[PDB]
Design a binder for this molecule. Structure first.
Ligand SMILES: C[C@@H](c1ccccn1)N1C[C@H](CO)[C@H]2CCC[C@@H](C1=O)N2S(=O)(=O)c1cc(Cl)cc(Cl)c1
Length: 133
């Protein structure tokens, strides 16, 4: 049932957010807002990125962050959630975007859960610091 509630809440959020100013909707259902535009290279699917990021739920609860850690994170572009793989490839290095990820582009129905429940819509602030081939 938390799965059914989460699906309805996420659908409502994405339906409302698509009308909000600055929100760009992609064919995938991934949405994004440009916070700061960078002038750097865009990563490819096989590249590694160094990023600062914060992940939060629609209620505003932060579940992950590089903030006050003293260090950025490093990820292979293709080995993160589909929402990230897609968004990173559209982001010039130096850019800060806020992405709104439907559950199908994140962890999905996910019968279990913990930080991320079933049918959970995820919001991420992503600052792409650098790209490495
Ligand atoms: C590698 C991948 C991953 C590895 C293992 C298990 C689950 N997921 N992963 C996590 C990384 C942190 O390494 C982080 C940033 C990149 C996107 C995404 C992501 O794809 N998340 S996250 O914010 O959605 C997230 C999700 C969960 Cl379940 C828990 C946390 Cl603490 C944070």
């Amino acid at each position: 049932k938390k799965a059914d509630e989460n699906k309805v809440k996420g659908e409502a959020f994405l339906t409302e957010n698509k009308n909000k100013p600055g929100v760009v909707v992609l064919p995938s259902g991934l949405q994004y807002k440009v916070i700061n535009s960078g002038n750097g290279v865009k990563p490819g699917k096989s590249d590694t990125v160094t990023v600062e990021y914060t992940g939060r739920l629609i209620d505003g609860t932060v579940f992950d962050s590089t903030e006050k850690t003293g260090k950025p994170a490093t990820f292979q572009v293709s080995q993160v959630i589909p929402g990230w793989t897609e968004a990173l490839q559209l982001m010039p290095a130096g850019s800060t975007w806020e992405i709104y990820v439907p559950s199908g582009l994140a962890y999905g129905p996910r019968s279990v859960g913990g930080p991320i429940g079933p049918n959970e819509t995820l919001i991420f602030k992503i600052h792409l610091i650098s790209v490495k081939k």
